[PDB]
Amino acid sequence: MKPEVEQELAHILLTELLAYQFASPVRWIETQDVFLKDFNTERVVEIGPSPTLAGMAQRTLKNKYESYDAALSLHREILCYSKDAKEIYYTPDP
Amino acid sequence: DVIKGKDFEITAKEVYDFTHAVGNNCEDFVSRPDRTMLAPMDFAIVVGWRAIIKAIFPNTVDGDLLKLVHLSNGYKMIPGAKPLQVGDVVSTTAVIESVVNQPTGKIVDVVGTLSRNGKPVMEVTSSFFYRGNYTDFENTFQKTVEPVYQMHIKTSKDIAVLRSKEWFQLDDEDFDLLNKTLTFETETEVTFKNANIFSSVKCFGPIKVELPTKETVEIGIVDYEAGASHGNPVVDFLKRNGSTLEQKVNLENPIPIAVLDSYTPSTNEPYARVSGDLNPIHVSRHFASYANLPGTITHGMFSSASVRALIENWAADSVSSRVRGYTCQFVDMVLPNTALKTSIQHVGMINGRKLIKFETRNEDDVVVLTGEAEIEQPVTTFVFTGQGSQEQGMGMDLYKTSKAAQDVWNRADNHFKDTYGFSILDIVINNPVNLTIHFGGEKGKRIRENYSAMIFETIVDGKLKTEKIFKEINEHSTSYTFRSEKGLLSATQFTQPALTLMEKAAFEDLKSKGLIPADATFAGHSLGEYAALASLADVMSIESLVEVVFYRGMTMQVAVPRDELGRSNYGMIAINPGRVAASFSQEALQYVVERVGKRTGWLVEIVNYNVENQQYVAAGDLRALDTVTNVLNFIKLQKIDIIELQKSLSLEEVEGHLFEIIDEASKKSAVKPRPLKLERGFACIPLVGISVPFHSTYLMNGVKPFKSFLKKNIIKENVKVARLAGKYIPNLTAKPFQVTKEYFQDVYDLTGSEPIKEIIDNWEKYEQ
Numbered sequence: 063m064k065p066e067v068e069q070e071l072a073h074i075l076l077t078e079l080l081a082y083q084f085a086s087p088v089r090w091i092e093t094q095d096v097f098l099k100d101f102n103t104e105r106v107v108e109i110g111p112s113p114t115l116a117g118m119a120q121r122t123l124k125n126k127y128e129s130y131d132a133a134l135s136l137h138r139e140i141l142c143y144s145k146d147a148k149e150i151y152y153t154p155d156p
Numbered sequence: 157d158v159i160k161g162k163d164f165e166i167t168a169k170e171v172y173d174f175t176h177a178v179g180n181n182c183e184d185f186v187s188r189p190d191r192t193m194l195a196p197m198d199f200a201i202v203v204g205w206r207a208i209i210k211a212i213f214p215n216t217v218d219g220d221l222l223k224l225v226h227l228s229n230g231y232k233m234i235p236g237a238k239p240l241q242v243g244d245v246v247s248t249t250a251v252i253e254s255v256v257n258q259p260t261g262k263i264v265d266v267v268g269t270l271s272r273n274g275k276p277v278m279e280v281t282s283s284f285f286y287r288g289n290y291t292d293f294e295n296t297f298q299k300t301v302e303p304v305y306q307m308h309i310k311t312s313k314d315i316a317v318l319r320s321k322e323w324f325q326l327d328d329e330d331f332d333l334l335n336k337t338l339t340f341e342t343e344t345e346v347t348f349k350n351a352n353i354f355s356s357v358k359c360f361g362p363i364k365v366e367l368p369t370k371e372t373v374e375i376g377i378v379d380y381e382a383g384a385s386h387g388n389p390v391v392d393f394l395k396r397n398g399s400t401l402e403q404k405v406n407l408e409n410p411i412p413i414a415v416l417d418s419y420t421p422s423t424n425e426p427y428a429r430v431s432g433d434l435n436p437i438h439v440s441r442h443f444a445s446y447a448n449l450p451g452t453i454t455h456g457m458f459s460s461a462s463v464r465a466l467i468e469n470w471a472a473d474s475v476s477s478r479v480r481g482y483t484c485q486f487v488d489m490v491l492p493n494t495a496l497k498t499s500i501q502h503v504g505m506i507n508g509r510k511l512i513k514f515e516t517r518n519e520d521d522v523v524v525l526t527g528e529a530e531i532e533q534p535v536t537t538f539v540f541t542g543q544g545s546q547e548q549g550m551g552m553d554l555y556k557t558s559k560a561a562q563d564v565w566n567r568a569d570n571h572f573k574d575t576y577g578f579s580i581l582d583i584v585i586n587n588p589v590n591l592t593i594h595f596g597g598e599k600g601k602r603i604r605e606n607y608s609a610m611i612f613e614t615i616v617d618g619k620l621k622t623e624k625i626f627k628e629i630n631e632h633s634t635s636y637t638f639r640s641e642k643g644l645l646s647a648t649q650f651t652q653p654a655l656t657l658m659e660k661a662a663f664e665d666l667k668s669k670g671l672i673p674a675d676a677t678f679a680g681h682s683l684g685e686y687a688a689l690a691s692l693a694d695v696m697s698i699e700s701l702v703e704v705v706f707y708r709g710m711t712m713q714v715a716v717p718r719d720e721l722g723r724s725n726y727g728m729i730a731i732n733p734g735r736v737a738a739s740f741s742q743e744a745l746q747y748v749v750e751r752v753g754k755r756t757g758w759l760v761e762i763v764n765y766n767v768e769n770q771q772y773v774a775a776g777d778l779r780a781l782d783t784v785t786n787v788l789n790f791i792k793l794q795k796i797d798i799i800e801l802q803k804s805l806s807l808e809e810v811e812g813h814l815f816e817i818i819d820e821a822s823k824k825s826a827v828k829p830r831p832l833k834l835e836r837g838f839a840c841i842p843l844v845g846i847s848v849p850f851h852s853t854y855l856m857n858g859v860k861p862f863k864s865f866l867k868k869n870i871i872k873e874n875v876k877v878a879r880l881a882g883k884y885i886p887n888l889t890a891k892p893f894q895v896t897k898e899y900f901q902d903v904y905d906l907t908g909s910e911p912i913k914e915i916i917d918n919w920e921k922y923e924q
Binding site: 074096100106122137143 | 408534537539542545663669691708856863867875881889890893899911923
């Protein structure tokens, strides 16, 4: 598709995706089952003032990815910005 | 003339031999079931070797090939290109980049390009040094490809400076250069006269402009041609006034990754055999003495490969694709059976790729091998928190130190002052109980027009009323006060902007530190959703972002009717389906809330799908939320399943058996007064501080005015489809963002919007 048209259609889609964002339940379980296995993401960085979505990713991994992660042998680092800032910045102590 | 090397195919046996030879035991290089076995990065030079080395042969590159030093060897994985596999046919090209008569010797820079399936895959740079006294300057040359320099023309002085340059020549001389992004993709050839001056300098290349569609279009050319010069003014000018598309940002301190003791092999004949480098000096002692060397020196390319196998281990975490570039400058010659000790150090970042600066010494603590390598981080996704704990002074620790953070907060706090006549920074810092906004003066009227531009739609007796947010704020208004019980950071309309700024500021700091990959996939929980898009896509400015999320907060605040105390008869509940019973499924919860909602007639809906059979948040009439908490306190105590009994016992009866338990729930729930207190059940925690059932079907009405607000703020000229496509994961669909007829259809199914229904129908009109 033409960029000048694709731009318009993406704009219109996004607009609706944000307008109706609070008009429909947050499909977060399905989002977690999209970025964990469908992307095979080894590093989940939570940006926020308290670890909430880092607790939720860790509960999801413990509950239904302790057999998929062993079957692929991939390690997953669930890191919140509030708590686990050091290794995200790569700033350890001696 | 471009040198072409023969088509080299990569076979499994060749890789096993090479990997054993160098000591690279990366799992990626072992043949497993249902796993294509990757070719090593190092293996690259093998393929190239026949072509690359052939570059130093030609008659006019005269020199003593016994006394030939290999100065440095670098690989550079071309962006997007997958690392080499087995069965890949790898065509090789080579060119002489530079040949220069340095006082002590001649330096020959060879650039190999590897091509798999027509496209280029990687670039292999090789610097060779002929030790000797050359003066063949007429034969010397340097056809460099310059790094693309990008210049932002913000002012009209830059324009006059550019137009003063004779080399700068647009195709259309009247082209408007204000507020543009020009990329100069120059190719600078230099023929030398002497060791320290040039004879012919010829920089040239197209000058593109970034369109609103993020596609570069040629608007002119560099046409620089000089004679006797002491430099290139085009690259000088671009360096002084432009960027390099990506910036090397050091860390505060280097990080000592590890100290690893490599061992050179007794013989070089295994590595020489696999690498097709049969340089006598490496294998035969008599050549080694005649070349004045201290013995059969271990291969330099072996020394590299026997280190690049440890950076791939320790920095890249035994993952091959993560290594993109690898350079190594062979300082000192090394002998067989040396105890090489590598000192690995992470140094900094460039565009979310780690930089690892290492040096290798022998047993004498003499610098033998040095180089660096740029390692992609683990494939990283971002998740942005929704509303939560808004403790007073969140992000201020960052805001005082970080510059980026200062620049975000400031820009937001300026816009808020100018537009809505308050300071968010103040509100976060000291959490004022009440805040007055005075509309006095021309500035004060504009702020009052900004506050009288806010409207929402609600259902009134089956009629859509477009009521006015801040109804009291009219033409005759001088002041308006926000009033909280304890603090205004607790009120949604300051909560949401405050949190969104903290996130944006944190992320913007990460960008300043250069820790953000260009492919990272981003998803935001509820409010956070907006912070992501601002942070990863730049779709909104800081000014547009805060203005949106403020309007969101206020739209959610007045979405529902409140009494004089400011309490609605709605709430939220945090259900744990594991606390009620292990047998209790997510579909059992969906069944229960469906049946309560349908019979009772009261709004109740699951609004957050948080954790599978452990956390869900259900919103609706706080009476209906009292029925379901009293049903899930009943079901646990009676230990009765609905999903077992709906199949195993009787069809449709389990509906009619739940029905009569809803009667005992709804008869006690309806008794309590309309500002009731919901009680903490077994598997239901009442969300304190929240009264509005958002993410439900209650807010269908509120979309229309809100959807108009984004169209005013969110401009299509800032929507960069590449930056969004396949990365953004909306909470509406829970599917990677793609501009397809499938996606549109799926969005129209979930959200009955006519402006996408027409696009679905006219899909083929937009295809062409």
